[PDB]
Amino acid sequence: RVHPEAQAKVDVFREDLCSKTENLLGSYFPKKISELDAFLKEPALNEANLSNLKAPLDIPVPCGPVNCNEKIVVLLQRLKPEIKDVTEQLNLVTTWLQLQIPRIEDGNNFGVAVQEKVFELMTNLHTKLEGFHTQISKYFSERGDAVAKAAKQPHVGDYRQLVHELDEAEYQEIRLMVMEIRNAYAVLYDIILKNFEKLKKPRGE
Amino acid sequence: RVHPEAQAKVDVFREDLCSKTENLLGSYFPKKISELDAFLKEPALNEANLSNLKAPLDIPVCGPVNCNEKIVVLLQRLKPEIKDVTEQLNLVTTWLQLQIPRIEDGNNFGVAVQEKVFELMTNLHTKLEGFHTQISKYFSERGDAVAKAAKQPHVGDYRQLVHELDEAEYQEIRLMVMEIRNAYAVLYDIILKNFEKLKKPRGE
Amino acid sequence: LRVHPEAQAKVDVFREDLCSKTENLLGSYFPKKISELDAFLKEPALNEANLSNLKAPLDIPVPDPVPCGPVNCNEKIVVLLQRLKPEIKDVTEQLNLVTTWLQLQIPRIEDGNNFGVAVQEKVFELMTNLHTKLEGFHTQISKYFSERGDAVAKAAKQPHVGDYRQLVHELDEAEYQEIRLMVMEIRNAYAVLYDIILKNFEKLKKPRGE
Amino acid sequence: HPEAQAKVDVFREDLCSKTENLLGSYFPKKISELDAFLKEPALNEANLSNLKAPLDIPVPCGPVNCNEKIVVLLQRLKPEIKDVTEQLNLVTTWLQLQIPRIEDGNNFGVAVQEKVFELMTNLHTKLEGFHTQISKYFSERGDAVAKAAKQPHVGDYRQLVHELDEAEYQEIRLMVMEIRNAYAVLYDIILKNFEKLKKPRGE
Amino acid sequence: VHPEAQAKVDVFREDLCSKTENLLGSYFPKKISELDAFLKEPALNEANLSNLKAPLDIPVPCGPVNCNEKIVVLLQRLKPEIKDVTEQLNLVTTWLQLQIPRIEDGNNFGVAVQEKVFELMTNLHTKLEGFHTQISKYFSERGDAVAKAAKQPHVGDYRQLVHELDEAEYQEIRLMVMEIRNAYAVLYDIILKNFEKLKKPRGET
Amino acid sequence: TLRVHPEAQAKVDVFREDLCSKTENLLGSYFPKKISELDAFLKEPALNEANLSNLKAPLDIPVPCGPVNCNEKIVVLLQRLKPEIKDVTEQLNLVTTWLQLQIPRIEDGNNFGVAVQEKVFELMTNLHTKLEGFHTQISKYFSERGDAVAKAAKQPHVGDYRQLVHELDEAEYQEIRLMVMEIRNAYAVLYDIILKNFEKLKKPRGET
Amino acid sequence: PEAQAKVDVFREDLCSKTENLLGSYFPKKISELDAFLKEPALNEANLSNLKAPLDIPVPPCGPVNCNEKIVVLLQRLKPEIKDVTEQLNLVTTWLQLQIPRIEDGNNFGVAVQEKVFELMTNLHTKLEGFHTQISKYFSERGDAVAKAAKQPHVGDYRQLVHELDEAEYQEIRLMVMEIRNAYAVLYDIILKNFEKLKKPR
């Protein structure tokens, strides 16, 4: 049993979470899909040739301070807030679906079977999207090791190419992250609307 | 075969464990959800600009480089929240294991409800395993970047690496607060709904 | 094979010693351990109101823009570890004793009357899951001093980095919370084993029924 | 709620117009392009020894360059990996939005989509490994060239650098074949099953 | 198939059958009483965990640091006990595989009895393989710990670590004697109970 | 239903005809030739050594150090081995794709023809798992033999590092031996299962 | 065509090999190996007698020889490892060519082959680890001897070298046992099921 103020706090949280998820679904998701579609179409993520990304690598070949790649860093400043929201909004929507699961009763509860099927997808997206924050910190750590190795031993030509190839790979990774983040919204937005009857009220009322 | 007096002190454990779980779930869980919803709404975990977070990194392009102040103040509030949720999860998990009746052939749906609720508690436990070690990993990873930046000042990536770990750590605190809020919320939800079958699966 | 009249004496004396142990163990040892560990949780040694009270003196000379003294291990954690180490010893030995008892209670394999066997297999499934947890606790204490020693040694080597001093303090804060989890886990391991065995003891000892 | 159907359907109709045009024109084009690229004398040499880059280390140090004959092939391979991973990722999402409302019983039209979706996931496994291996190649060769110069008295490190090149030539040749086969397999399975993939229920 | 070749193989089956029945009859009962007696000796029942601590002679601002003599004398007794059980397990496993009859259509239950008893033998083989290389890891880890203590004498944790590894290896050697005792006891139990079906699974022909 | 351009559609059908025309000539001519060529290569005295002491690469370190060469006897075998791994991995990938194009429309009825293809395709994955590891095997050998020779030169007093280098050569010889056996068996087993099931692989549903 | 001949000479060569192989080689190898175990080389009464002379001044140091008593056993082990892995691979491939056309239903003759083939995969999983562990031994001993000479004050690195020697000796005893049991189990299961393996339909 719960006393009335306890039941108030949880039910206010449910209606706050419902009020968000309904609004989030209606406005935020279409807007985000349109924004990320346009962001892919911009000339920043449509580099005709990948050689123009090649940052200046100042090392004396037989060392001066070499800053990081500017053309990648500016894209990471736009990507980092776009990763932030999906991880929150997916986690918000996932939590909403968990609270919509009714009491566990006998038989082939098909409304529950639909919820678990939609919930299974939300776990699969959560697998893909969790990797991206560490992959930004990984890039600078891996590039820092490559730039240091190039400076430590300038006679090895591969360590110079390594720093340029990590930049070309990171550019492609960032464009995949935006595409995945666009398609994460689009698939969620589609699958929830299609099954919204059974997700909200699985048994019927 | 058991001695009556030794049996009695095990019955005291179950009674206080049941007396905890009711009073605990009744007040502690709603209160924690309200507090962690408020904590997410505060301006500490709603930094409008991520550029405002980046702490001073003093290395001559050697003076002492401090830890990021604004992350340590948040970690001081987060650490007691991780302690509590993992304690109360472990508490409730144990209560549900003792509610499992004798393993019999007939009348096992009440048991099957407990096993599905117990399945969720292990999945939360799996998520809340990582938060213990996460804080020690951050200072180890950040220190390594600060040391590498000081050891080799010509590499600009190690300077960026330290600021990026601070941005990544801030967001990881943000997700951890949400996860602990949602951990309480989902536990409260499922136990409150299924409380009839969890406490008394067979009936009686 | 008919073995040997004295050979069966070796095994059945072990069987009866294990049956005498497990029955006496279950009745008297488990309730004592659950109450002792509940009392140990209640004690102020595992109820630090502030964790910064545990902070060990980390004496390293901090440099400025113009060798080390002896850095000790955390006293307040080590005293708790010396209390936990015999508790980990006991539960792993008694779990291994009880798991062995249950395996010798498994009857000769028939295709029919196998429900009583299926009860034992479900109880054994839990004992396997406890063995998974408590095997990890033994090497955790070694890993604490290993990781702290690495942090302390390296904080001394690079004293300009402030994160490593904080790291050593955070390992002590993390280790304290970890120890408190282990005492709970070990209390709950005794509590859960006692419950499931006492409830199902009819089918565990005599599965076919007699 | 009903406006939400207009915004989501316009995106589906946009993604349909992209995918259907792309699948008809782009996939046949790419298969002929990559099949021709394999038949070129760049990817077919009579002896693998001609790749062998000049490795100048004083045997008892000067600058050692990368293998030029591999680098020029990597300049042609990198845009091909970029494209196929984007179009596969696009087609994956097109199939996910075609999945109808989840309804009771074993409806076969959905099972066709899941069978085709399993293949797209299996191709996704192969094509993800291609991206990071190019960075891995230069890292491993950079370690080998450094180690060879560090200790010139060992002959194996001299041989290692040549072997990484001759192996990378083989790896680049497979990656072109795999990406050619990825287009061919996707085109074949979607074209055949297009009736059930687009309209599984049939209204 | 050849005449005298058959003789070379069936003598090995006779040798393995004669080994197993004599082994199971006398060796296993003996090993259980001996290993239980080992566990009750005062070497493996140290009343206080401080007494096992070895002298760690390093100057705190290097001289020879010996191995823990109380653990080394225990390892001299444990090593042959590991050797014996790992061999007799591997012998008993092979005997059971040769008792598997021809694979006939459908399901015969006598074969399912063998596969259930065989499943346990492979599960025990997993446990007893870990014991062999863990002794080499103990000395490798203690050597590293002592070397780190000697290289940095200002660090008090490395001193503790070396005493913690000795406390852990004592309590590990404690379990390894119990596990090998329990391996014999469970193997004797399961084979003696099911011997009718293990030896002759299709009944008497 | 999808509409594709008639010239674009003509481009793909030519690739199907290229793969079927290759596979048909490839399966009949190349595979039995390769199996007999590899069986001969195993029988040659290069790959059969009773005495493994002859392999010993003369390791010169003063018990500053002079040049240590690779094992010449292994390197000459690797020059013959590398083009064999090239071909079998390419021809496997050719035939693997030929199965995937032969998979008909996913239908409710008459699915045994499809189950035959999926069983044969299952083997072609298991071979692809084994034949992947042979590619990087050679890179690992010279990398590990180098590290062994470098350690031996760095620390001459340890006699085990000298033995290590000879033991990697003996292992690599017995490895190369095995990898030629596997590639012969890969050609043999593919030829067997494809020839036996060819009716159901090519035309699974029936004839139209 | 004439290419069909090339494969049929290879198949009937493999079928001729497998009958000669199984009929003589496997019985001989089981007896040969079981004799190996009975010899006093692998039956050391006390493990302390294998302890190699570890000469380090308790940094400059003299030559530490490899363990002679383990190396002589490794000279005998290596040719026995070679043989099993080659004959296992020969027999595995023979069984794969014995697999008939994939026909409808669930023909049990095929199911017998698949069960016997499953065992040959499990033995292969066991034996591939034996090959690289000899390289692992000298690599791990070489590092342990180096660490002992580098830092002579550490007593554990001296003990570590003698423990690898005892551990390797015991590992060679098991590798011979496993190789004996690999031939014995293969001979048993193939000979028992030979009717269904050769002609399943």
If you had to describe this structure to a student in words, what would you say it looks like?
Chain D: Belongs to the PA28 family. Chain D: InterPro entries: PA28_C, PA28_C_sf, PA28_N_sf, Proteasome_activ_PA28, Proteasome_activ_PA28_N, Proteasome_activ_sf. Chain D: This is Proteasome activator complex subunit 1. Chain D: Keywords: Proteasome. Chain D: It holds the Pfam family PA28_N. The structure is a homoheptamer. Chain A has 205 residues and is an all-alpha fold. The first copy, chain A, has one domain (1-205). Chain A contains five helices and no strands. Chain A has helices spanning 4-41, 70-99, 110-152, 158-194, 196-200. In chain A, helix 1 (4-41) crosses helix 4 (158-194) and helix 2 (70-99) packs parallel to helix 4 (158-194). Chain A starts with a helix and ends in a 5-residue tail after the last helix. Chains in contact: A-B, A-D, B-C, C-E, D-F, E-G, F-G. Chains D and F meet through helix 1, helix 3 and helix 4 of D and helix 1, helix 2 and helix 3 of F.
